[PDB]
Design a protein around this ligand. Structure first.
Ligand code: NAG
Ligand code: NAG
Ligand code: CA
Lengths: 49, 100
């Protein structure tokens, strides 16, 4: 269930991202891109188990 | 006046917004007389002058055409930084070594 919750959190983070034309990035996109390593770590943890 | 027209040529203004910005800057220059001094600067994570001018130049016909061509040749790319653009603008408005 914790895996399910982190998966839903990843989906919410993906939904929250906004894409700008020519290299521009929203200030929130920086935070939502820095939150990735937590998700990759938890998915590596489930894979390891 | 002493304008510094700060133009936001970042990624997010690509396409229609850039077209409107450049037409708007041209029509803004078209309200500047010969007693007004103007520079046009553009910023995307770092600010620069759009043209060969490095300081507020007189807003006469030839300088205004230089600035209009520099604005028409401008492109949208990069992230925005309103601090490095306003630093540039305020610094250029404090340049008293030139005619103003
Ligand atoms: C002005 O236009 C020319 C013609 O394409 C281009 O090569 C040049 O890069 C433009 N100026 C700037 C500052 O990009
Ligand atoms: C103006 O001249 C002074 C002294 O020559 C110099 O220190 C300064 O950097 C120049 N530019 C501005 C924008 O004040
Ligand atoms: Ca922007």
């Amino acid at each position: 269930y914790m895996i399910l919750a982190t998966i839903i959190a990843n989906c919410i983070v993906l939904a929250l991202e906004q894409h700008l034309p020519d290299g521009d990035k929203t200030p929130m996109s920086e935070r939502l891109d820095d939150t990735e390593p937590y998700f990759i770590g938890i998915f590596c943890f489930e894979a390891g188990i | 006046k002493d304008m510094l027209i700060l133009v936001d040529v970042s990624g997010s203004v690509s396409g229609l917004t850039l077209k409107l910005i450049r037409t708007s800057v041209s029509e803004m220059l078209e309200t500047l007389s010969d007693d007004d001094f103007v520079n046009v600067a553009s910023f995307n994570s770092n600010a620069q002058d759009v043209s060969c001018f490095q300081h507020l130049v007189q807003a006469n016909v030839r300088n205004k055409k230089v600035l209009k061509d520099a604005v028409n040749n401008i492109t949208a790319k990069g992230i925005t930084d309103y601090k490095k653009g306003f630093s540039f603008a305020f610094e250029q408005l404090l340049n008293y070594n030139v005619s103003r």
